[PDB]
């Protein structure tokens, strides 16, 4: 059992420099009269689910919302239990 499902590649017209910092790179390049020949090639790294990035503190704080809710529930329960 191996991965034989006949994968098909996407359409090459989908990848556009627009919406990616490569548009800024192109603007800086044209300010000198230059143009990147490989701009559309890499644009997929900015198009799909990788378009949304997360910060360092956000990465460190991966499960604090749920853990904080669990903690507040637990401390409330302990406070209501020991006060008896």
């Amino acid at each position: 059992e191996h991965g034989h499902s006949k994968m098909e590649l996407p359409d090459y017209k989908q990848w556009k420099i627009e919406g990616t910092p490569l548009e800024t790179v192109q603007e800086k390049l044209a300010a000198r009269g230059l143009r990147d020949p490989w701009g559309r090639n890499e644009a997929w790294r900015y198009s799909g689910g990788f378009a949304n990035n997360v910060s360092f503190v956000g990465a460190l704080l991966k499960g604090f919302k749920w853990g904080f809710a669990a903690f507040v529930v637990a401390v409330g329960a302990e406070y209501y239990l020991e006060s008896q």
Binding site: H2, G3, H4, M7, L9, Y12, W15, R35, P37, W38, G39, R40, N41
Partner: protein
């Protein structure tokens, strides 16, 4: 590993994909047997950046003594299939 056994169709498709993405080449004018220096009018540096794009694409780098004398997508696909021992 879990790597799918890539075939000639996949290599050619991916090479043509990278060729189409490049702006300097009109997608409707390229072909499998499309030459680089004369059919398309691309510089030698343009051929070396095409080699760079292929190397980034497939995860291995072609020796320069083999890279400098590759001028068609068909012979490039053939070289890469020979390197990767591809059946069909």
């Amino acid at each position: 590993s879990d790597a799918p056994p890539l075939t000639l169709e996949a290599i050619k498709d991916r090479v043509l994909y990278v060729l189409k993405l490049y702006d300097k080449i009109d997608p409707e004018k390229l072909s499998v047997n499309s030459h680089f220096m004369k059919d398309l009018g691309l510089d030698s540096l343009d051929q070396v950046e095409i080699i760079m794009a292929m190397e980034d694409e497939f995860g291995f780098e072609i020796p320069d003594i083999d890279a400098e004398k590759l001028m068609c997508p068909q012979e490039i696909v053939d070289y890469i299939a020979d390197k990767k021992d591809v059946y069909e």
